Amino acid sequence: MSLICSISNEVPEHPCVSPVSNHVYERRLIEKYIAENGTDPINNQPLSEEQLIDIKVAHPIRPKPPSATSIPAILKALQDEWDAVMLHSFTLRQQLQTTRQELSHALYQHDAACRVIARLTKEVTAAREALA
Amino acid sequence: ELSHALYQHDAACRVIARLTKEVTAAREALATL
Amino acid sequence: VREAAAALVEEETRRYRPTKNYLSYLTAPDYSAFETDIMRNEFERLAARQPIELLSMKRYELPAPSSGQKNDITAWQECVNNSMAQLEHQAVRIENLELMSQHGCNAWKVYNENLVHMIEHAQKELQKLRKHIQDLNWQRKNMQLTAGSKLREMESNWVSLVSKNYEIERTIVQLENEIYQIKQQHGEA
Amino acid sequence: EELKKHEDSAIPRRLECLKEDVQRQQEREKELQHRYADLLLEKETLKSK
């Protein structure tokens, strides 16, 4: 595969495989995770930086575009991308907060459905007893 | 888990759909005596 | 059929009543996990919807100190320094354009190919996945209809058995009335 | 995938109950027909007199 790190969902600069999950990772990110958490991130099994398998494949990664870019313009574009990332991460916060509400409301209706099913089961059985 | 719960909710609808017809037919059956 | 029934299904959901100790206490997320305070201040900034703290455009162009600063040698020095930096920024820029004209054309073609290769791998995985889902659906459909046939067959038997039984019950009553009458007629004789 | 496992749970349950319903009705039929056969035989005793 043209690699993507499993944390960032994006192509790594320094890539490594966890043998504990066979997923591909950007090594400085998962080493930071290991130090903070002590586990594989995907399945929470224990992991260490020692177990990580290095990759040394070169990068085909390409500017986006080069024609705009200069040192003032890079910093201008980087800020905009920085704002876009912070908008993206806060959207995840918003999304996760939203999924709280919709799941909870769904769960109530399915739980209450069980109580209806229970009542209807009684109704059906009484109707069968009537048939007897 | 949301989508599962949604489909569970939807699966419940099919269960209620079956039960509604079954109740209706059984009450119709009792009307025949 | 089910279209009408689905609105009849809705009926009892309209009659749900205050009991909302709903199951969402299971596995509550954590907002906080690895937030730095700087990131938190940014999330505070986006919660306050604060406009961009703009990176200064004026550094691109600065021709002179301000009028009060103009009587300071060091103030002019910083602007002379500023003008020196901007020329080298153009020098580095023009150097970049030389490479980008020849090699960037080829590199764009190679990179655009790489996106196609990502799409080809994605479409292959998609076609794998869509096939697998539809294979699962054929497992779902075959399983439902195999079971559904046998139950329906049993149900047809069940309807016939139920109907015939009470018919026999009806005739049982017919026997008992007739047997009783014969017992009366023989008993009186 | 989850739905199939619930269907895999539901299908024996539906089969278990409905077959038992059918079985009881056959048991009901056996009880009914046994009595019902005897009473004609009883009627034949009356008819013999």
Q: Is C156 a member of any domain? A: yes
**Gyration radius from chain A CA atoms:** 26
Mutate to test the interface with C, among B20, B30, B32, B33 (most CBs of C within 10 A): B20
Residues sharing a CB contact under 8 Å with residue C143, sequence separation 6 or more, in sequence order = D4, D7, D11
Which residue in chain B is spatially nearest to C26 when comparing CA positions? B1
Q: Is C185 a member of any domain? A: no
Boundaries of domain holding A98: 3-132
- CA-nearest of D41, A54, B2, D3 to C139 is D3
Are A16 and A30 spatial neighbours (Cβ–Cβ below 8 Å)?
Answer: yes
Å between B7 CA and nearest CA of chain D:
8
Residues 1-33 of B with CB under 8 A from D: 4, 7-8, 11
Å between C178 CA and nearest CA of chain D:
9
Boundaries of domain holding C34: 1-172
- Token readout for A88 is 């993206």
Parallel, antiparallel, or unpaired for β A53-54 and A24-26? unpaired
Q: What is the maximum alpha-carbon separation in chain D?
A: 73
Are A37 and A43 spatial neighbours (Cβ–Cβ below 8 Å)?
Answer: no
Are A105 and B5 spatial neighbours (Cβ–Cβ below 8 Å)?
Answer: no
Amino acid identity for residue C185 in this structure: Q
Q: Is C182 a member of any domain? A: no
- CA-nearest of D19, A83, B6, A53 to C53 is A83
Q: What is the CB neighbour count within 10 angstroms for residue D26? A: 14
- Inspect the interface and report whether the beta carbons of C117 and A2 lie closer than 8 Å: yes
Q: What is the CB neighbour count within 10 angstroms for residue B8? A: 19
Residues sharing a CB contact under 8 Å with residue A34, sequence separation 6 or more, in sequence order = A47, A48, A49
Alpha helices, DSSP H, located in chain A: 27-37, 71-131
- Token readout for A120 is 């209807």
Q: Is C106 a member of any domain? A: yes
Q: What is the CB neighbour count within 10 angstroms for residue B27? A: 12
- CA-nearest of C17, C132, C16 to B9 is C16
Number of domains in chain C: 1
- Inspect the interface and report whether the beta carbons of D2 and B4 lie closer than 8 Å: yes
Helix or strand (DSSP H, E) at C128: helix C73-188
Q: What is the CB neighbour count within 10 angstroms for residue A30? A: 25
Residues sharing a CB contact under 8 Å with residue C13, sequence separation 6 or more, in sequence order = A109, A112, A113, A116
Residue B5 has, within 13 A of its CA and on its CB side, a CA count of 18
Locus of tokens 């399945």: A43
Number of domains in chain A: 1
- Token readout for A106 is 């769904």
- Token readout for C95 is 């150097």
Residue B8: its chain D contacts at CB < 8 A?
6
PDB experimental method: cryo-EM
**Gyration radius from chain B CA atoms:** 14
Residue B26: its chain A contacts at CB < 8 A?
124, 127-128, 130-131
